[PDB]
Amino acid sequence: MKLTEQQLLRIFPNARLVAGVFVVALQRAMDEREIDTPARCAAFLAQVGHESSQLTRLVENLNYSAQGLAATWPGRYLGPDGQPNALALRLARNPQAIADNTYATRNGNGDEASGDGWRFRGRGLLQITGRANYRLVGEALGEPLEAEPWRLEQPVPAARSAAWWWAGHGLNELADRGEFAAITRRINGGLNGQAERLALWQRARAVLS
Amino acid sequence: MKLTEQQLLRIFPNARLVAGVFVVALQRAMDEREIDTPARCAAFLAQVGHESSQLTRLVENLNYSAQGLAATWPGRYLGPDGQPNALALRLARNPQAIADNTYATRNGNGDEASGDGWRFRGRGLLQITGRANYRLVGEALGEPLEAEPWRLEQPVPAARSAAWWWAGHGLNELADRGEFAAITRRINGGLNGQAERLALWQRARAVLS
């Protein structure tokens, strides 16, 4: 394989500003994890491109309204009334407080007071969340992700972390067989955004063919 | 008073990469705090110019060697053999750990495990350090500096925080009287870097005359 910046802009047009640095980051991460054929690369690029809004969103958005908190984490933020409860009202529209509360004690995070929920909110192309996962990924990649979680918003850690996760979940062999929807299920635990993933995938297959 | 980009670049030649994004910030901050004459403005720009390396260094550098630790905080990191002690060896060349230890429980910071020391390390033109000071200044500027301390590395909060501190410590009236060395003592508690402060001062006086 070989990916050209021309090919990137045709697949991720909204990455014009980042495509220059991402092209080397992606090419190297893809070689590193044997994402090494048009079929493997098209599937990989289609999935990470959906999950990262074409390389423009590498950090999770926690700007929820009180109604959004109640819809998203109802066991936490929905009252017996069908209305946002008092906790939802207290945290509404405050991303740091939302993450610090919602993700406390999740995936190796400390408690609310630790600030771990915000500190280790989702980052990357295929997003990594929680202290223990930043630790695990940082150690697999030889980068200081637990100490510097913001590194996952930068091209090389984002690309290498996504390629590592991809190859480690058997997604290369799924791509070999053309089982794209089965890849979507493994990444999403469902088929949310499948229509969008499929359109990116068919673009990428045409470009990389 | 009016301050032009070309004037700023004549006072701060090394500001060439940021002058365009600092000129309005500085003009507005100076107006806001009555830094409103050539003499007040020349003194202010000379001091913030020295303290920020002509607007090129808006966050403190904590990349110390074990020897630098011992030399900079001899009381904390220097040993009786004139050698860095064991704590200094532990922390050497790790800025996060250095800040977390050296500044813990300083200026409202928590302990070394809180991470306050690094989180609220020095930022701005006249540098602000420590949780309680970020909260003090954020509240006085109406900016969310305690929640987002990195904002003090941006032009408007850096300039406004420096103008607020300047006017709040009587330095406008000292500038009125030409008492430049008195200003240095209030900022530095000594006369360190006075040669460079005076050089910038006389330059600023000529440009703004």
Author numbering:
A (entry chain A), B (entry chain B): 1 to 209
What do the authors of the reporting publication say about this deposited model?
Finally, the crystal structure of PaGH19Lys was determined and solved to 1.8 Å resolution. The PaGH19Lys structure displayed a fold consisting of α-helixes. The helices are packed to form a structure with two subdomains, the large subdomain (Met1-Leu55, Pro155-Ser209) and the small subdomain (Thr56-Gln154). The protein contains a deep-spanning catalytic cleft with an active site comprised of amino acids H50, E51, E60, Y103, Q127, T129, I187, N188, and R197. Among these, E51 and E60 aligned structurally with the catalytic base and acid glutamates in the structurally and biochemically characterized GH19 chitinases, suggesting similar roles in PaGH19Lys. Based on the structural comparison of PaGH19Lys with the well-characterized GH19 endolysin SPN1S, , the amino acids E60 and E51 were identified as the putative catalytic acid and base, respectively. Some lytic activity could be observed for the E60Q variant at 1 μM, but it was still significantly lower than that of the wild-type protein. These data support the idea that E60 is important for catalysis by PaGH19Lys. Comparison of the structures of PaGH19Lys and the SPN1S endolysin revealed substantial similarities, particularly in the active sites, suggesting that they have similar functions. The topology of the endolysin active-site cleft may reflect adaptation to accommodate the peptide stems of the PG.
